[PDB]
Design an enzyme around this catalytic site. Structure first.
Site, short mmCIF file in Angstrom:
data_model
loop_
_atom_site.label_atom_id
_atom_site.label_comp_id
_atom_site.label_asym_id
_atom_site.label_seq_id
_atom_site.Cartn_x
_atom_site.Cartn_y
_atom_site.Cartn_z
N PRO C 6 1.14 -1.56 -0.10
CA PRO C 6 0.04 -0.03 -0.03
C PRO C 6 0.55 1.20 0.06
O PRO C 6 0.30 2.40 1.01
CB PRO C 6 -1.00 0.16 1.33
CG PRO C 6 -0.03 -0.40 2.59
CD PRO C 6 0.86 -1.17 1.27
N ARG C 7 2.06 1.41 -1.10
CA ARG C 7 2.93 2.65 -0.93
C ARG C 7 2.80 2.95 -2.49
O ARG C 7 2.80 1.99 -3.61
CB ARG C 7 3.93 2.64 0.07
CG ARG C 7 3.69 0.69 -0.17
CD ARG C 7 5.75 0.82 0.25
NE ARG C 7 6.61 0.92 -1.05
CZ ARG C 7 6.88 0.02 -0.36
NH1 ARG C 7 7.26 -1.33 0.48
NH2 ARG C 7 7.66 -0.28 -1.63
N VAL C 8 4.13 3.71 -2.52
CA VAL C 8 4.66 3.65 -3.98
C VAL C 8 5.54 2.94 -3.68
O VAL C 8 6.53 2.87 -2.97
CB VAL C 8 5.64 4.88 -4.13
CG1 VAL C 8 5.52 5.54 -5.76
CG2 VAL C 8 4.93 6.13 -3.10
#
Lengths: 284, 96, 95
Positions: C6-8
């Site tokens: 859940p991130r870049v």
């Protein structure tokens, strides 16, 4: 006579300078890689080049490009070259032809996806445009992805009326990131600029899905650049790129000159340098 | 890539480099040329080989010493010459 | 399926390059709440999202393979980067 060895047409009002890039092989296949808009000029000298041209209708673009193709096909033209056009309203007109790679070929590379200079070399080896290795698609299959703006950072100083400054570049810090390309010239930390040759340090091109997107990236990049030791034209380019008429995409050859504001530059203090002046002074 | 094994870049600066980059990407050896005033320009270090060209010549005249360049081209083993833009890019005599 | 991030990610660059979509700009628009397909955000409808080309990313690091990839340390006396068509650099601790 002073400029060249040797010593008349209808003047035109507020035209748009449009070029078309062409590639032709030894096997009579010719293709165009779409236009570029070099309408931004200072005293009729190209400054900021953009592709594709946002302000024309696709119908028109194709007319111009097809015109260029027809010409180069007519001459059985081989390798890479460019057909320039001037454009008013919905009428366009031939201007000149450059049988070479142009400085601003980068942006066309960026929107087509086609490495021009690699292609130049394949063509000189004779391969066909549409060979497997050369991998240029059939014209129908050549499209535009996004738009790209190119600006050339030079040592021309706008306060000194664009006299190419000379000297050693003590600090050169380039930029990068998504949609940024740099083509380096005489631009590394150690280098000294001589006055003998042209002033160009680095070519900075940025790309975006929308020209409005690309303009943003260009802005950031120009600010991000840190070059010290010599004056540059950056503050000039910033003013032209910041100008709202540039962002509109509707401009003409007469866009510079007509607008004087671009030549007024912010009086920026660097607190930092002045601090070192003090420190250095009392130190000695 | 077929009949060009090595190429001479009859130019300087940004444009010279771009070509070299292209060649190297295509496994093609590259040869640079520099004027006396350009012993410093980093385009000359970016090639596989390099030679001075415009000896005793005025700085601009140096990259236009057609004959010299061919001798350099021939001595190098250069299968081809890329003139970039400006200088001898459009010069007929050289092309011929 | 194996995992979800859940991130870049580090390798988000290449996806930017083939889609044409600036991910991080988008991240900021989304956190400001704009819709994906707003005018300003300019992400096209899925049907309209295509692949241009392909992109490879590699990360230059100080891991030395002779020393079994022990991150070398020290001062970088000379750093000369590259560029040209189809080249992007995302600088880290590299000047």
């Amino acid at each position: 006579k002073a400029a060249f060895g040797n010593d008349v047409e209808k003047c035109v009002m507020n035209p748009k300078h449009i070029e078309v890039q062409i590639l032709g092989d030894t096997h009579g296949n010719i293709v165009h890689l779409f236009e570029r808009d070099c309408s931004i000029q200072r005293r009729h000298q190209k400054v900021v080049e953009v592709a594709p041209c946002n302000a024309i209708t696709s119908e028109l673009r194709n007319r111009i490009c097809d015109a260029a193709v027809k010409l180069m096909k007519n001459v059985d033209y081989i390798n890479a070259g460019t057909v320039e056009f001037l454009v008013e309203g919905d009428d366009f007109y031939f201007i000149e032809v450059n049988p070479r790679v142009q400085v601003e070929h980068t942006i066309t590379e960026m929107i087509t996806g086609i490495d021009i200079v690699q292609s130049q070399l394949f063509i000189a080896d004779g391969y066909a445009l549409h060979d497997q290795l050369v991998a240029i698609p059939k014209q129908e299959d050549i499209h535009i992805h996004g738009s790209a703006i190119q600006s050339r950072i030079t040592t021309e100083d706008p306060l000194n009326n664009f006299m190419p400054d000379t000297g050693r570049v003590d600090t050169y810090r380039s930029t990068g990131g998504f949609g940024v390309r740099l083509d380096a010239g005489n631009g590394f930390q150690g280098t000294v600029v001589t006055p003998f040759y042209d002033s160009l340090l680095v070519k900075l091109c940025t790309w975006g899905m929308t020209f409005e997107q690309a303009t943003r990236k260009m802005r950031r990049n120009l600010i991000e650049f840190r070059i010290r030791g010599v004056k540059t034209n950056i503050p000039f380019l910033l003013n032209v790129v910041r100008h709202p008429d540039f962002a509109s995409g509707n401009y003409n050859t007469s866009f510079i000159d007509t607008t004087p504001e671009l030549f007024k530059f912010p009086h920026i203090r660097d607190r930092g340098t002045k601090t070192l002046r003090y420190i250095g002074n009392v130190t000695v | 890539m077929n009949r060009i094994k090595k190429v001479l870049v009859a130019n300087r600066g940004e444009i010279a480099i771009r070509v070299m980059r292209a060649c190297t990407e295509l496994k093609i050896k590259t040869v640079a040329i520099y004027s006396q005033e350009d012993t410093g320009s980093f385009h000359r270090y970016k090639s596989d080989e390099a030679y001075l060209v415009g000896a005793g010549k005025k700085p601009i005249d140096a990259y236009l010493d057609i004959e010299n360049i061919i001798e350099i081209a021939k001595e190098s083993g250069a299968d081809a010459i890329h003139p970039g833009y400006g200088f001898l890019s459009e010069n007929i005599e050289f092309a011929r």
